[PDB]
Amino acid sequence: MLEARLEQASILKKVVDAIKDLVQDCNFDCNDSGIALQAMDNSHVALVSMMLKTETFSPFRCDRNIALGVNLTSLTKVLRAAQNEDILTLKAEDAPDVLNLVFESSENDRISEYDLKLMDIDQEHLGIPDTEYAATISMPSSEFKRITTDLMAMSESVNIEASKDGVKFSCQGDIGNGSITLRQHTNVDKPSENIEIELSEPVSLTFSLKYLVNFCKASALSSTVKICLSNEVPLLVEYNISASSYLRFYLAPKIG
Amino acid sequence: MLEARLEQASILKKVVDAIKDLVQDCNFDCNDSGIALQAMDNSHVALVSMMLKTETFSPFRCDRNIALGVNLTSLTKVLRAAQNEDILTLKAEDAPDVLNLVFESSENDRISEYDLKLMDIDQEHLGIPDTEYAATISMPSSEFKRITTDLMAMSESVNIEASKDGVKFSCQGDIGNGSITLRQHTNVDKPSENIEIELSEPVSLTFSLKYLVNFCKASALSSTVKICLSNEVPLLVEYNISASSYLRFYLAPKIG
Amino acid sequence: MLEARLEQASILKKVVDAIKDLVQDCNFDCNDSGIALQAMDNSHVALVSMMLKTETFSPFRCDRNIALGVNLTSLTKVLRAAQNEDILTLKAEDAPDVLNLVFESSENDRISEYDLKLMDIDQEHLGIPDTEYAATISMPSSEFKRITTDLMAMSESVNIEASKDGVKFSCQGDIGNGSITLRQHTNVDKPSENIEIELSEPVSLTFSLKYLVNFCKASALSSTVKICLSNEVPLLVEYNISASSYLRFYLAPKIG
Numbered sequence: 223m224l225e226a227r228l229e230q231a232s233i234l235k236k237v238v239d240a241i242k243d244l245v246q247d248c249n250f251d252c253n254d255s256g257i258a259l260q261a262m263d264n265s266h267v268a269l270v271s272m273m274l275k276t277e278t279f280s281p282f283r284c285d286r287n288i289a290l291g292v293n294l295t296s297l298t299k300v301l302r303a304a305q306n307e308d309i310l311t312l313k314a315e316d317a318p319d320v321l322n323l324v325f326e327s328s329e330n331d332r333i334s335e336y337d338l339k340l341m342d343i344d345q346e347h348l349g350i351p352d353t354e355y356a357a358t359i360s361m362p363s364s365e366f367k368r369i370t371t372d373l374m375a376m377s378e379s380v381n382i383e384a385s386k387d388g389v390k391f392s393c394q395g396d397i398g399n400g401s402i403t404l405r406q407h408t409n410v411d412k413p414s415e416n417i418e419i420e421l422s423e424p425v426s427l428t429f430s431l432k433y434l435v436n437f438c439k440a441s442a443l444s445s446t447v448k449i450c451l452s453n454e455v456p457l458l459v460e461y462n463i464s465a466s467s468y469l470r471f472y473l474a475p476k477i478g
Numbered sequence: 479m480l481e482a483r484l485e486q487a488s489i490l491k492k493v494v495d496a497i498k499d500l501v502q503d504c505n506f507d508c509n510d511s512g513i514a515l516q517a518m519d520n521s522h523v524a525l526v527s528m529m530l531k532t533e534t535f536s537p538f539r540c541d542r543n544i545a546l547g548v549n550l551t552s553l554t555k556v557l558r559a560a561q562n563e564d565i566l567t568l569k570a571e572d573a574p575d576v577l578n579l580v581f582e583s584s585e586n587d588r589i590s591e592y593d594l595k596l597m598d599i600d601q602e603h604l605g606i607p608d609t610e611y612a613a614t615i616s617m618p619s620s621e622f623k624r625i626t627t628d629l630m631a632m633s634e635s636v637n638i639e640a641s642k643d644g645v646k647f648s649c650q651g652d653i654g655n656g657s658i659t660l661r662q663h664t665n666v667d668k669p670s671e672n673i674e675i676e677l678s679e680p681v682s683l684t685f686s687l688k689y690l691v692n693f694c695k696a697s698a699l700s701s702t703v704k705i706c707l708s709n710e711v712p713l714l715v716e717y718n719i720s721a722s723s724y725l726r727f728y729l730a731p732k733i734g
Numbered sequence: 735m736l737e738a739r740l741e742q743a744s745i746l747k748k749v750v751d752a753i754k755d756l757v758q759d760c761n762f763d764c765n766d767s768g769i770a771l772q773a774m775d776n777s778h779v780a781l782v783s784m785m786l787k788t789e790t791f792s793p794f795r796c797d798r799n800i801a802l803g804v805n806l807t808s809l810t811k812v813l814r815a816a817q818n819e820d821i822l823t824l825k826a827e828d829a830p831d832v833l834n835l836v837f838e839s840s841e842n843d844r845i846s847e848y849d850l851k852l853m854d855i856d857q858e859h860l861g862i863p864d865t866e867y868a869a870t871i872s873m874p875s876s877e878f879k880r881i882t883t884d885l886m887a888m889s890e891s892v893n894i895e896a897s898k899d900g901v902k903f904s905c906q907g908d909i910g911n912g913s914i915t916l917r918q919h920t921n922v923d924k925p926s927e928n929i930e931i932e933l934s935e936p937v938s939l940t941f942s943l944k945y946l947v948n949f950c951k952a953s954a955l956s957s958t959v960k961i962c963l964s965n966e967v968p969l970l971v972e973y974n975i976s977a978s979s980y981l982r983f984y985l986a987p988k989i990g
């Protein structure tokens with residue numbers, strides 16, 4: 223059976239909010255190692271890859287594998303009834319018809335309990351191979367959110383060009399051409415504002431801004447976002463929820 | 479004639495906002511004792527009962543009975559032009575065609591004056607008899623607002639079960655079953671957060687969440703809300719605006 | 735060629751936001767003295783008159799006259815990508831196809847650059863003669879915003895009556911009659927709250943509230959607003975962005 227406690231419901235609330243606009247029906251794959259999610263968005267363009275590792279929970283138990291077929295709009299209805307600082311416990315039996323969710327107030331000793339009906343969802347689960355990326359940009363998540371948000375108003379597409387010195391986001395639109403250039407930047411007393419760029423080779427590729435804006439709905443999960451460009455494989459946009467757990471989005475560059 | 483001063487327009491603004499989504503056309507019944515309102519909602523399901531007692535005003539005058547036939551969307555248009563800390567004065571002559579409203583700024587000596595046209599509205603005014611309730615729950619208004627709001631997303635109905643120890647809100651929905659359980663709770667240094675439950679006998683009854691959400695639009699009038707359950711008479715949900723005045727909502731439980 | 739730096743993008747952002755709901759297609763007339771705008775609203779009722787004088791920029795260069803034909807919804811798309819505290823530089827060559835806009839971050843050394851495509855817009859540029867106004871009311875911009883906003887909910891029209899003592903805004907609506915009366919008011923320790931009224935002769939005239947609400951979208955440009963009434967010429971509603979620069983709106987009173 224499954225039994226998993228988060229100290230703050232916050233983490234799960236943020237996770238689901240970061241996925242639900244891309245994916246409606248998906249499985250949460252529970253086992254020894256934690257709770258994973260792997261699903262394409264509804265248009266079958268982007269791949270969503272979540273791993274909530276056992277260390278993120280406190281405590282965590284999952285004896286046998288359990289696939290929790292969940293509608294995310296249904297789960298969002300439940301999770302909105304959890305406050306961010308509620309102690310959250312997930313429970314599910316072997317061959318579950320429901321996922322049991324318990325939210326416990328910190329002070330006033332309110333206890334909320336929901337039995338969310340599960341459904342039969344077919345898994346796809348593509349193989350995510352190991353990869354050495356051409357360029358990796360680490361920057362504040364709010365800045366990447368603003369960039370994609372600003373350019374989206376102007377264009378459907380953004381060219382991302384990585385160099386040793388910096389990274390340039392470029393687009394052409396009906397109103398004109400635009401670009402936003404960031405270069406490596408370090409603040410001793412505000413290291414959270416740092417922009418760090420590691421380059422093994424030049425990479426200049428074009429991506430859907432609409433998908434990038436949706437990826438930036440994970441901005442609440444982490445202060446920093448890792449943008450990983452490759453000339454061979456899809457872009458990886460990574461939010462590390464903790465030392466262990468991550469929410470990842472994969473997006474292929476646009477090819478004629 | 480009528481002449482009634484509130485120190486802060488706030489009280490009246492909050493009152494009307496707490497009623498206008500339920501009732502459009504209603505009478506304000508003015509006399510010696512203050513200003514009352516008694517009207518069913520537009521679907522004729524819930525009863526709204528307001529009493530602004532003479533002690534709430536400063537000063538208060540009403541020589542003879544005057545029924546002020548008012549459209550609440552029209553009055554809302556006027557009251558939005560009063561700031562919360564405006565000194566508010568209501569005036570009306572015998573056999574009035576208009577209600578006169580005067581809002582006086584605290585500092586900058588702005589004076590606003592409106593003559594709201596009255597209309598012919600037929601009164602119903604049901605007899606509200608005296609009643610010994612099976613269970614009375616006193617809790618913070620924000621908590622009851624959150625509860626009803628959260629469950630509304632999931633269900634049209636909520637079962638409220640009162641015991642000595644606690645109170646359970648339960649519902650069944652398309653997405654599953656849910657419940658929120660509160661028990662008696664007292665904080666010495668934050669007594670405003672206290673949950674107090676007085677029970678003469680067990681009561682478990684089902685009510686419309688949509689009506690309860692609308693009742694919770696009075697949450698600004700008082701930090702505390704009194705929920706009064708009976709096996710004989712409709713539920714009473716009470717907001718005490720001051721020691722004297724109250725806004726009350728009555729709702730019959732659902733019966734097959 | 736044109737080259738003009740603002741210390742804070744804020745000024746330009748606020749300016750364009752204050753005009754775009756009235757005017758879509760307009761010219762920015764650049765020369766020695768600064769950057770001007772003069773255009774009627776889309777219904778050809780109100781006249782918009784902006785002057786950003788050379789002293790407002792730091793530094794400013796414009797060798798020859800350049801008319802920058804701009805769509806304001808297109809420019810708004812660009813300016814939303816400038817943060818309020820960005821150093822903003824406008825550039826344009828002689829016979830320009832584009833306006834070049836550069837936004838430079840204060841700390842993290844982000845640089846944004848846009849080439850906004852210009853268009854062929856015919857100028858009207860009416861003669862704005864010099865005028866001695868019957869009454870001039872100087873008051874806080876937020877108060878005028880609130881007044882027009884409040885009365886708009888009730889009426890399409892507002893009568894503005896100026897006297898030595900004070901100014902009265904009056905309207906008749908379907909819900910009734912309303913008025914807001916301000917008188918001369920001075921606070922030694924909060925002079926920004928002051929209401930000052932200078933009268934050479936009585937003036938009582940009626941104006942469109944819808945136009946006045948739109949004029950109040952310039953409220954962010956200045957803490958104080960100057961309302962200038964005349965029995966001969968259109969009302970002038972003036973926002974002084976700095977000692978030099980201004981955004982002005984002209985509106986003729988309603989005549990049968």
